[PDB]
């Protein structure tokens, strides 16, 4: 719980990934898209504008910009082009996003972003699948 929110601010480059394509398959992404999305090494930019956070992911395949306020539910248009009811909290040093499905045939996910020894780590969880990603400061 020691890590402060401000330590996340900056630009981060993907250096390792595990189970990302499998995570995308689990949440219903088609083969061509999940293959292409998993081949990239995106840059994640985290910035704070007043009380609005921005987690923007940039890559050759798609740019994904997410804006939110902590503790405030919002409708997220996720990169899979489906809409979700998303809620991001900051708990014990970590950003936790609950991306809740709206349509019953969709899938919900939990995203956790945290810092360890200068690196930024993420997990994306849905159903039986957890994806793990690691980033280094740009």
Author numbering: 0 to 137
What text comes from the article?
Folick et al. further identified a Lipid Binding Protein 8 (LBP-8) that mediates the retrograde signaling between lysosomal lipid hydrolysis and nuclear transcription. Interestingly, LBP-8 itself is also sufficient to prolong lifespan through activating NHR-49 and NHR-808. Here, we have expanded our knowledge of the FABP family by reporting the first structure of a C. elegans FABP, LBP-8, and exploring its ligand specificity.
The crystal structure includes all 137 amino acids of wild type LBP-8, 92 waters, and two sulfate anions. LBP-8 adopts a typical lipocalin fold, present in all FABPs, consisting of a N-terminal alpha helix-turn-helix motif lid (αA- αB) and a twisted beta barrel containing ten antiparallel strands (βA-βJ). The interior cavity is lined with polar and hydrophobic residues generating a solvent accessible surface area of 825 Å2 and volume of 1170 Å3. There are fragments of continuous electron density present throughout the pocket; however, we were unable to model in a fatty acid with confidence. We do predict that fatty acid is binding to LBP-8 based on lipid MS data, therefore, the fragmented electron density likely reflects that only a fraction of the LBP-8 in the crystal bound to fatty acid, or the fatty acid does not adopt a preferred conformation in the pocket. A network of eleven waters are present in the putative lipid binding pocket and anchored via hydrogen bonds with amino acids glutamine 56 and arginine 132. The LBP-8 structure contains two lysines (K24 and K34) and an arginine (R33) present in the alpha helical lid, and a hydrophobic patch (25-IGVGLLI-32) within the turn region, suggesting LBP-8 is a “collisional” FABP, and directly interacts with membranes or membrane proteins to acquire fatty acids. The interior cavity of LBP-8 is lined with hydrophobic residues (F19, F60, L65, F67, F73, F94, F110, T112, and F134), which can stabilize fatty acyl tails of fatty acids via hydrophobic interactions. The absence of these conserved amino acids and having large pocket volume suggest that fatty acids can bind variably, possibly explaining why there was such diversity in our lipid MS data and disordered electron density within the interior of the crystal structure.
